Amino acid sequence: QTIKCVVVGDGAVGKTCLLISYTTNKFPSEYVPTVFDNYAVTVMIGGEPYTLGLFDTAGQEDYDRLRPLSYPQTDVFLVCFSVVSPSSFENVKEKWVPEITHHCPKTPFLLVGTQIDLRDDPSTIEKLAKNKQKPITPETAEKLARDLKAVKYVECSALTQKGLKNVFDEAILAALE
Amino acid sequence: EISAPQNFQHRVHTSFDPKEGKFVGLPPQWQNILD
Ligand SMILES: Nc1nc2c(ncn2[C@@H]2O[C@H](COP(=O)(O)OP(=O)(O)CP(=O)(O)O)[C@@H](O)[C@H]2O)c(=O)[nH]1
Numbered sequence: 001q002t003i004k005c006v007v008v009g010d011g012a013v014g015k016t017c018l019l020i021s022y023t024t025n026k027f028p029s030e031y032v033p034t035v036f037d038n039y040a041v042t043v044m045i046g047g048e049p050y051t052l053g054l055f056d057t058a059g060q061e062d063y064d065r066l067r068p069l070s071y072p073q074t075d076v077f078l079v080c081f082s083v084v085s086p087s088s089f090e091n092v093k094e095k096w097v098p099e100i101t102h103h104c105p106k107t108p109f110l111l112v113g114t115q116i117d118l119r120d121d122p123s124t125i126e127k128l129a130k131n132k133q134k135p136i137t138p139e140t141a142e143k144l145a146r147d148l149k150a151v152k153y154v155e156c157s158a159l160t161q162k163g164l165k166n167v168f169d170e171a172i173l174a175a176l177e
Numbered sequence: 178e179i180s181a182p183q184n185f186q187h188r189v190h191t192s193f194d195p196k197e198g199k200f201v202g203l204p205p206q207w208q209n210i211l212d
């Protein structure tokens with residue numbers, strides 16, 4: 001059978017890189033915003049192969065009416081934010097969870113923190129500090145996941161691949177559960 | 178355990194085509210909204 005996994009979240013959060021890094025073990029060398037892309041991979045769990053269908057959506061608000069047309073029969077959502085983008089974290093509560101709830105009320109989702117390799121980056125810590133803000137800690141991310149009311153919180157880096165496979169392994173388990 | 182993913186396929190790629198001035202490579206359910 002086919003697992004339908006839909007990835008949502010603000011622009012610049014890193015959804016395309018997350019997916020290309022995992023499905024291909026290559027990091028995209030360019031930034032190109034998404035309207036819509038559908039990729040497929042095959043995964044095997046306990047001897048049983050599954051097609052994992054991965055829906056890469058646009059985080060730009062311009063696609064608010066169109067994006068959800070892709071949400072029917074979703075098995076699991078990845079609701080993404082960048083651990084170094086507080087505005088993307090706020091929109092999880094304000095835009096993204098409300099959106100996927102409305103369309104798919106009984107579908108499980110994971111809260112996914114992206115770009116964790118940038119937490120200890122001096123010059124992104126600087127960019128944040130010029131507007132008196134700071135990265136999101138796991139402690140804070142995990143409260144939001146509990147409260148909002150996700151399967152769990154996972155985080156990763158598409159660039160280093162730290163925790164990346166785990167994100168999708170938990171997505172797969174959520175869909176099959 | 179769960180295997181690493183295999184047999185990567187890029188099935189749909191939607192873009193806006195400025196020469197034609199319309200989205201191209203659309204999912205079918207978007208198509209009957211936009212075309
Ligand atoms: N350092 C670092 N950079 C990342 C990571 N993931 C993505 N990026 C960078 O962040 C930018 C945004 O990545 P992209 O994957 O296009 O984000 P997106 O969420 O798909 C944007 P849209 O919603 O418009 O499709 C790119 O410049 C990319 O190189 C990461 O884990 N680490």
Ligand SMILES: [Cl-]
Nearest residue numbers: 001002003175
């Ligand atoms: Cl399934």
Ligand SMILES: [Mg+2]
Nearest residue numbers: 015016033034
């Ligand atoms: Mg993208």
